[PDB]
């Protein structure tokens with residue numbers, strides 16, 4: 348089970364080690380954020396903002412703006428436009444786990460809306476590991492089945508003649524996506540698979556998939572071979588490590604969003620306007636999103652103030668609600684859910700809600716209706732289940748544009764204000780518009796982001812919406828990440844308080860123990876499995892169990908890594924490690940104290 352795990356380098360021998368050389372870029376520590384754990388709110392905004400801008404930075408080798416990546420984008424838009432020209436029997440599927448699956452969902456929503464607005468039959472669908480419940484809840488373990496990915500693809504593709512399958516996995520990791528790409532390659536008469544991720548192919552996961560005979564790396568290598576015949580495409584730009592190691596929802600999520608929106612817009616422009624995709628025109632769009640970074644981070648002082656407000660509510664416990672209008676609600680939902688595994692948050696801590704119409708978005712909304720508190724997300728859920736129980740310690744962030752129903756915004760804000768003073772808004776406007784006076788009075792320190800008009804004949808209005816969604820994503824992801832960092836939930840720039848919710852996260856947890864303890868691979872595996880299964884003692888059957896067993900047992904547990912790490916550092920029992928942790932103000936402080 349652990350053959351691919353490299354032995355821990357000896358003390359002082361980490362420099363130039365084979366262990367370090369094998370760390371995927373998506374898992375690497377960012378050299379600019381080693382002191383993220385102790386940074387104040389303003390410094391966290393600066394660090395995370397710098398990292399967010401790295402996706403656009405043009406060595407120029409395989410970067411997002413490189414000729415190589417742009418050429419692949421032109422080729423993929425060429426294949427997509429062939430499907431858009433033949434709606435009868437055509438389909439575009441986007442797929443992934445976690446944030447990658449939620450990005451697949453968002454792309455399908457955006458592009459089906461684009462098609463509906465033009466009076467065309469919608470041709471997009473999404474596949475998210477675990478189904479619709481995964482859009483709103485933490486169900487990361489569902490991506491560990493390649494067969495689940497294949498079964499879901501077969502269901503949506505049944506009866507179709509030509510299917511583009513865009514498999515998204517930031518780490519080139521998810522078994523759900525590997526299975527789909529592999530099966531697409533078995534029938535190139537119908538399927539055109541496109542793999543989107545942010546590692547070199549040689550860094551794709553090569554550990555065994557429990558229900559598949561090829562590893563992700565083997566599938567990606569087969570795609571490279573098929574790309575020579577234009578039968579598959581690997582779209583894997585270099586963006587560099589995340590500010591919080593392995594936090595694929597951040598740069599990886601942003602780069603996924605911009606890469607796909609740009610190439611899909613180019614495919615639609617080819618069909619509708621007759622202008623073929625080009626490197627020049629892809630860059631004009633990508634650079635518009637680059638400008639959105641400056642526009643957004645010009646609000647760094649207010650982003651830091653909001654981060655502190657959210658962190659105060661969490662420290663007291665209170666809950667934080669991110670209430671977004673229309674598609675900004677999807678961005679809000681995407682933010683809250685990731686806090687569960689990233690920081691060990693409870694599902695009640697940070698939750699996003701969508702105000703407005705969601706009727707054409709979900710393919711199986713029955714999987715969500717009256718399913719429990721972990722599945723709330725709608726306008727009705729917010730008004731009927733959340734609002735009546737709001738207290739003075741809760742924070743509510745409202746995200747909207749000046750084109751939204753501002754009477755409805757004002758009504759809901761006033762209802763919330765009766766329960767808590769901790770309200771703030773992120774309002775997007777087009778240069779020329781001003782916020783109604785009653786909203787200026789309700790939000791005297793509103794985060795106002797003003798956007799110049801765009802004059803792209805075809806894509807202008809779509810880009811205007813997309814850049815506001817990206818801007819919202821940067822603000823919310825920086826606020827939620829920072830709010831938890833301020834509470835001592837990370838160590839250096841590593842997710843100390845991670846929940847081991849899937850196999851990728853299990854490997855991250857094991858690697859974290861090797862890195863911070865410096866102890867052997869055997870000792871770190873033993874401590875990790877002992878902490879996961881506690882109070883069940885370790886047995887040979889547990890040591891030999893599939894990783895899925897460890898994930899099932901670990902996924903709802905808190906502080907597994909600091910318990911396993913303190914056990915290694917103090918050479919103590921789990922109960923002694925739990926006592927050490929209980930006596931400290933945070934997991935960050937307990938581990939820093941043990942390391943000193």
Ligand SMILES: O=P(O)(O)OC[C@@]1(O)OC[C@@H](O)[C@@H](O)[C@@H]1O
Nearest residue numbers: 444445446447516517518521595
């Ligand atoms: O396949 P990937 O996009 O790398 O990662 C997929 C994913 O579900 O893995 C577990 C967490 O890291 C989630 O935040 C992440 O979206």
Ligand SMILES: [Ca+2]
Nearest residue numbers: 902903904905
């Ligand atoms: Ca629990």
